[PDB]
């Protein structure tokens, strides 16, 4: 019968590893680097677009940074198509929680549920896992500003600063060097860009090859604002920090 | 070789190896004999034990007041098939107030075993059955094989060294067929038949299993001291 053609996506290796999860992570390691840095008064999300072409429409484009609700956003590393499936699920889950409790969903709860879905694809169903790693940047009134990451295994962890995608080894070392706990958003912005600028496989880091976003309490009195940076705004912030 | 992984595959010569391997399980099973006259039908079965401390595996199963079989091979498969026969016999009685014909019984077993040999996932039955019975057209003896092939016979035998008993019955055909209105003589002929398949071992009191059905005889099984008469 059909047994002959089954890859058996949800099995263990002799060493106790999940073949498909490991190979999915290998896929993600070639994806454009995405960085998240959490400050005391906000969060930064920075991501490098995959080898841009000059005729690509840059302003009306979305590849790396997606909005889940007003308080939570994600940076993507891996297959974009896979990520969008998960993003729509996450957006729906956030609205279900709001409908049920009349309160915006706590960041961890959203992250756990999305990570539980990924877990499912590694344990049952016989389907390939989602070739995607997320960086979740969000706020709620319990824990305040939070950074998380999830990967195809369905395992998630919390961070002060973290990178996913390509050159994470080099990127994590540079973040570990210059990061400190009393850091501000504007400082975190500068660290995020400096790290990408040194870990990039491109010749020079430019505005057209970047996606940038912040989550501050920079709105008027005790409320959170999401800023997805425009092309011109990235061009300005790149000049202001002295990279171009 | 490359064509025995499952029952859904034909070999280049047109063989179904999984069905043939199921047939092989019957040859390993203990010998059992079936034979009939015009008035009665008899099953004789050599039971097998694990060791001296164990009991002897029961070979004969009752299906209705007028029908039953003996098994050789996987006993759980015989339980499934006998249970199916019990239901079909019972359906015929409740719905049509009609005792199920032994020929239809065979046809139903054939069709049940066949479906298992044409579909992916499933496996063939690993057991051979000798169905005896007495219906509106007299006494009957059937031989079921898990390939699906069912055959009506005067006499036969299946299991290990069954060829000895089968040759004997082929010689004795003219004698035992006319044993009408005499149960004990028809059993004796069946006991003498199964004796042609014995090696080193002989028929003891808790080893031999006999069943009979006929004109004015419901399907009844004899074990233990009840078969001491025939040793």
């Amino acid at each position: 019968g059909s047994r002959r053609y089954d890859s058996r996506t949800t099995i263990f290796s002799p060493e106790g590893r999940l073949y498909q999860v490991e190979y999915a992570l290998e896929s993600i390691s070639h994806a454009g680097t995405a960085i998240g840095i959490m400050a005391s008064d906000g969060i930064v999300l920075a991501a490098e677009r995959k080898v841009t072409s000059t005729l690509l429409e840059q302003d009306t484009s979305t590849e790396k940074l997606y909005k889940l609700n007003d308080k939570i956003a994600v940076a993507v590393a891996g297959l974009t198509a896979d990520a969008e499936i998960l993003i729509n699920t996450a957006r729906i889950h956030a609205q279900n929680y709001l409908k049920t409790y009349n309160e915006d969903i706590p960041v961890e709860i959203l992250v756990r549920r999305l990570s539980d879905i990924k877990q499912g694809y590694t344990q049952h169903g016989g389907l390939r896992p989602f070739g995607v790693s997320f960086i979740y940047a969000g706020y709620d009134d319990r824990y305040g500003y939070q950074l998380y990451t999830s990967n195809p295994s369905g395992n998630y962890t919390g961070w002060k600063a973290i990178s996913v995608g390509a050159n994470t080894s080099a990127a994590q070392t540079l973040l570990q060097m210059d990061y400190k706990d009393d850091m501000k958003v504007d400082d975190a912005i500068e660290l995020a860009l400096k790290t990408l600028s040194k870990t990039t496989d491109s010749s020079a880091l430019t505005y057209d090859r970047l996606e940038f976003a912040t989550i501050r309490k920079g709105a008027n009195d005790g409320e959170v604002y999401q800023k997805i940076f425009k092309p011109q705004e990235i061009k300005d912030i790149l000049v202001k920090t002295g990279i171009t | 070789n490359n064509y025995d992984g499952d029952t859904v595959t034909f070999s280049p010569t047109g063989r179904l190896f999984q069905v043939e391997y199921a047939l092989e399980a019957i040859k390993q099973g203990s010998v059992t004999v079936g034979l009939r006259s015009n008035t009665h039908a008899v099953l004789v079965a050599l039971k097998r034990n694990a060791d001296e401390l164990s009991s002897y595996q029961k070979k004969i199963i009752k299906c209705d007041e007028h029908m039953g079989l003996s098994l050789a091979g996987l006993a759980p498969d015989a339980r499934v098939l006998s249970n199916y026969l019990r239901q079909q016999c019972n359906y015929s009685s409740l719905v049509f107030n009609r005792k199920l014909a032994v020929e239809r019984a065979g046809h139903l077993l054939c069709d049940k075993a066949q479906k298992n040999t044409q579909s992916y996932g499933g496996r063939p039955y690993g057991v051979g059955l000798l169905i005896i019975g007495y219906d509106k057209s007299g006494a009957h003896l059937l031989e079921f094989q898990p390939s699906g092939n069912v055959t009506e016979l005067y006499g036969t035998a299946i299991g290990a060294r069954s060829q000895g008993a089968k040759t004997y019955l082929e010689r004795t055909l003219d004698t035992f067929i006319k044993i009408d209105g005499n149960p004990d003589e028809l059993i004796k002929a069946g006991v003498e038949a199964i004796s042609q398949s014995l090696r080193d071992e002989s028929l003891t009191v808790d080893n031999l299993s006999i069943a009979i059905v006929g004109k004015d005889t419901p399907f009844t099984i004899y074990d233990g001291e009840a078969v001491a008469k025939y040793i």
């Binding site: 409908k99 049920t100 409790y101 009349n102 309160e103 706590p106 961890e108 709860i109 009134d141 319990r142 | -």
Partner: protein
């Protein structure tokens, strides 16, 4: 099941719930507690169809307790009330709806404010300073309209509540065998043993 009341004061929520359980022409019990603790700072009283009331109350209780363990965190009274309303809102269009009316008294530890929610079996939620279900309201509401002040103490609230129970005991046709009173505040839930 008949009389359930609720009064939100300055620093607490007070729930009063009748003790009688009547079936036919017999009062089977006169010491029934018509309430469940959903969380340390959230209490729900209930009244309605026999069986449904307790079955619903405990189902909600279990769900909230499950949430508490999972998140190691207590849901706000507002959040619990919304969850409860939705469950009843689903229920009303089911094959056999829960015929249960509830009051949810809770103390929000983040806001440091007591909160009283009234939800009927249709899933009709309202936040109130004082509430009641069934015929109880027809007597108490007008009495509370008059005597109730928003800055009252817990002791003033209990006296106001005594005034309601006295009026019910005078004008209600059925003997409801008094009430069990419970207070919900910053320190949690406690029962008034002498009322």
């Amino acid at each position: 099941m008949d009389i359930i009341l609720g009064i939100r004061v300055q620093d607490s929520v007070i729930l009063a719930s009748s003790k009688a359980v009547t079936r036919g022409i017999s009062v089977l019990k006169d010491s029934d507690d018509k309430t469940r603790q959903l969380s340390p700072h959230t209490l729900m009283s209930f009244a309605g169809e026999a069986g449904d009331t307790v079955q619903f109350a405990e189902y909600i209780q279990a769900n909230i307790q499950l949430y508490s363990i999972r998140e190691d965190y207590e849901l706000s009274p507002q959040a619990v009330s919304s969850f409860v309303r939705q469950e009843l809102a689903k229920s009303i269009r089911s094959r056999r709806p829960y015929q249960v009316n509830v009051l949810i008294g809770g103390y929000d530890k983040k806001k440091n404010k007591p909160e009283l929610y009234q939800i009927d079996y249709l899933g009709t939620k309202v936040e109130l300073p004082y509430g009641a279900h069934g015929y109880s309201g027809f007597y108490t509401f007008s009495l509370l309209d008059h005597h109730y002040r928003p800055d009252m103490t817990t002791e003033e609230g209990l006296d106001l509540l005594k005034l309601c129970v006295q009026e019910l005991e005078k004008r209600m046709p059925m003997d409801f065998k008094g009430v069990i009173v419970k207070i919900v505040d910053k320190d949690g839930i406690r029962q008034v043993d002498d009322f």
